[PDB]
Amino acid sequence: XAXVXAXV
Amino acid sequence: XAXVXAXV
DNA sequence: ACGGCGT
DNA sequence: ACGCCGT
Numbered sequence: 001x002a003x004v005x006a007x008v
Numbered sequence: 009x010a011x012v013x014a015x016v
Numbered sequence: 017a018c019g020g021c022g023t
Numbered sequence: 024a025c026g027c028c029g030t
């Protein structure tokens with residue numbers, strides 16, 4: 001759920 | 009029902 | 017009845 | 024360096 005690199 | 013990773 | 021990620 | 028859900 002977090003998007004820091006992927007944003008799933 | 010929500011699809012945030014599975015979407016059932 | 018449902019599980020996932022890359023810069 | 025990052026954590027989330029509803030029909």
Ligand SMILES: *C(=O)c1cnc2ccccc2n1
Pocket residue numbers: 001002008020021026027
């Ligand atoms: C989002 O909050 C989140 C939490 N855990 C994960 C584990 C594996 C892949 C993606 C994820 N996303």
Ligand SMILES: *C(=O)c1cnc2ccccc2n1
Pocket residue numbers: 004005006022023024025
């Ligand atoms: C994004 O691509 C990414 C990759 N590795 C991580 C490790 C820890 C926190 C956030 C990250 N984000």
Ligand SMILES: *C(=O)c1cnc2ccccc2n1
Pocket residue numbers: 009010016017018029030
């Ligand atoms: C969707 O709204 C939803 C709600 N509760 C669940 C529980 C278990 C599996 C899937 C679900 N989906």
Ligand SMILES: *C(=O)c1cnc2ccccc2n1
Pocket residue numbers: 012013014019020027028
């Ligand atoms: C998606 O794969 C997924 C997995 N675990 C979760 C836990 C809490 C909220 C959303 C989630 N999504």
Ligand SMILES: [Mn+2]
Pocket residue numbers: 019
């Ligand atoms: Mn699960």
Ligand SMILES: [Mn+2]
Pocket residue numbers: 022
């Ligand atoms: Mn990775």
Ligand SMILES: [Mn+2]
Pocket residue numbers: 029
């Ligand atoms: Mn719920």
